[PDB]
Amino acid sequence: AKEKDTIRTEGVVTEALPNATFRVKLDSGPEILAYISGKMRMHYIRILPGDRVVVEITPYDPTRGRIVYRK
């Protein structure tokens, strides 16, 4: 089925954490745990604090996200 409820909202990176997990403050409002894309990791695209990435968000829990796009 792939539930396409996936919330494609932008956020500027507040903070860096390990394993490429990042508190990113959103255009939407909150700062929530959002970890990297696999794609980005593969491509070695270094997320650094102060960047407008696209944090994909689950409707089950927005408090965790997933970074999609390169800054």
Next chain:
Amino acid sequence: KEYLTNERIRAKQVRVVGPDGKQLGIMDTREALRLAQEMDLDLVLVGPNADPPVARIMDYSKWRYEQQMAEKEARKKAKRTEVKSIKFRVKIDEHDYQTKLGHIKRFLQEGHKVKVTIMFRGREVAHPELGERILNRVTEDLKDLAVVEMKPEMLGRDMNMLLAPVKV
């Protein structure tokens, strides 16, 4: 400081200067040496730049020792605290920051000027702001102990600030 003495002298006629700052006249090198011997002291060709290139009786060795003693005091106080450098980084976490701050405080107490420096990599966008966030805060914390002499200043791949202490 390092002068030319008794048997180093080839200046034929020296405008002789006695033990204390005397003016006897223009004596031959040999004559000057003889005079020195008479007092037992050391005749010092202090200047070949002068008028009849000049040699001056003194206890050269002793004088030098004295100078060194005096100079030692000066030389010890010549360095007398320089620059301690600390390299922060754009990310910086809290305990580390605290540690750094403590170090800086210690340095200030000791008496040294402090290069509060940041090394950078890529991503120059948030860079200066981030630096400010650290550095200015740090300065504020040590406002009781330190004075800003250099502000957020660029070196290209870096950034640098300076904190001399408050009281000399």
